[PDB]
Design a protein around this ligand. Structure first.
Ligand SMILES: Nc1nc(Cl)nc2c1ncn2[C@@H]1O[C@H](CO)[C@@H](O)[C@@H]1F
Ligand SMILES: [Mg+2]
Ligand SMILES: [Zn+2]
Length: 338
């Protein structure tokens, strides 16, 4: 409640898409997740659903945020706060509000908080090739993604004061647990095109077919009944977490460039380490001495972003995001100047 002025001013227009997440980072002193978490969890009314106190949530938001590495350029508490902000925005839209249930809204916002917890600034491929402690632990299969979720529940349940899932029912926790685990694991990029195709075939194409009839009262109930099933809700949740995770190209141009520079720096550190240690170079194009950042961002957007957000926009209707995507894409094209 009693938040100091600079941090309180940074979180004024937090419902809006245009949000100064880096002012919050500077204001909070690399602690943006706890302050943004407090307001976001309260606004939805998550501790009323979970039956937790304010002090239980503060201890929970603290211990996860401590395990986020400040040394990492991109994968830190500020990134998870940006994803949490993106998550809440998509949940607040009319398509997602009317489709999803309150249990799903809680699972999404919790998942966004923990999805990259204890990131080593490195990819899965690096850890498998290096023979890391977690690579051997998870058998070179969803190494980081399983570690993020597994460690998050170890921190939450393992300590009594940190446990936000203390007063819940037996059935309510397991459905919530299965929901959070699935959304965190869905962020793995090897299954990127799998999660995009399953979204288009099961949601968008049926919804496109049903919309041919019109806006009749009986037909809207069929659109409701079809989307609101457990299978399709999960596919919407898998798509929502994926989009919010890589929503930085759809931000305002200042933030887009900042997110681009940070993730690029995190690769150059990895590429320098792989050369010195004598590991196989899994990311050859992302080297500080040869990489074009503008040209790299164009390749990333064309491969991952453009087709995914096309599907997500067609479903949810996101005119601000797709307009920013067009403005940022053309800016990266303009920086060649040769
Ligand atoms: N803007 C981005 N550019 C590039 Cl090359 N990779 C990015 C960008 N934003 C996110 N990523 C990557 O996407 C993955 C998370 O979905 C991570 O491996 C890494 F963060
Ligand atoms: Mg990930
Ligand atoms: Zn992520």
């Amino acid at each position: 409640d009693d938040v100091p002025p600079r941090i309180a001013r940074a979180m004024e227009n937090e419902e809006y898409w245009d949000f100064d997440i880096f002012e919050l980072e500077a204001a909070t002193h690399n602690r943006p997740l706890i302050y943004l978490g407090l307001k976001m969890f309260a606004r939805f009314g998550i501790c009323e659903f979970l039956h937790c106190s304010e002090s239980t949530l503060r201890s929970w938001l603290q211990i996860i945020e401590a395990n986020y590495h400040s040394s990492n350029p991109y994968h830190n508490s500020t990134h998870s706060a940006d994803v949490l902000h993106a998550t809440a925005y998509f949940l607040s839209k009319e398509r997602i509000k009317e489709t999803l249930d309150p249990i799903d809204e809680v699972a999404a916002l919790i998942a966004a908080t923990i999805h990259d917890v204890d990131h080593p600034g490195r990819t899965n491929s690096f850890l498998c090739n290096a023979g890391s402690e977690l690579a051997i632990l998870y058998n070179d299969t969803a190494v980081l993604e399983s570690h993020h979720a597994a460690l998050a529940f170890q921190l939450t349940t393992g300590d009594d004061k940190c446990n936000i899932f203390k007063n819940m029912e037996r059935n309510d926790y397991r459905t919530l647990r299965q929901g959070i685990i699935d959304m965190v694991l869905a962020t793995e990029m090897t299954k990127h095109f799998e999660h995009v195709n399953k979204f288009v075939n099961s949601i968008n194409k049926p919804l496109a077919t049903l919309e041919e009839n019109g806006e009749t009262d009986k037909n809207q109930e069929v659109i409701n009944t079809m989307l609101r099933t457990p299978e399709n809700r999960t596919l919407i949740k898998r798509m929502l977490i994926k989009c919010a995770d890589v929503s930085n190209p759809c931000r305002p141009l200042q933030y887009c460039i900042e997110w681009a520079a940070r993730i690029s720096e995190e690769y150059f550190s990895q590429t320098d380490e792989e050369k010195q240690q004598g590991l196989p170079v899994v990311m050859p194009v992302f080297d500080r001495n040869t990489c074009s950042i503008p040209k790299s961002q164009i390749s990333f957007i064309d491969y991952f972003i453009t087709d995914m957000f096309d599907a997500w926009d067609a479903f949810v209707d996101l005119p601000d995001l797709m307009q920013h995507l067009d403005n940022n894409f053309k800016y990266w094209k303009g920086l060649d100047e040769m």
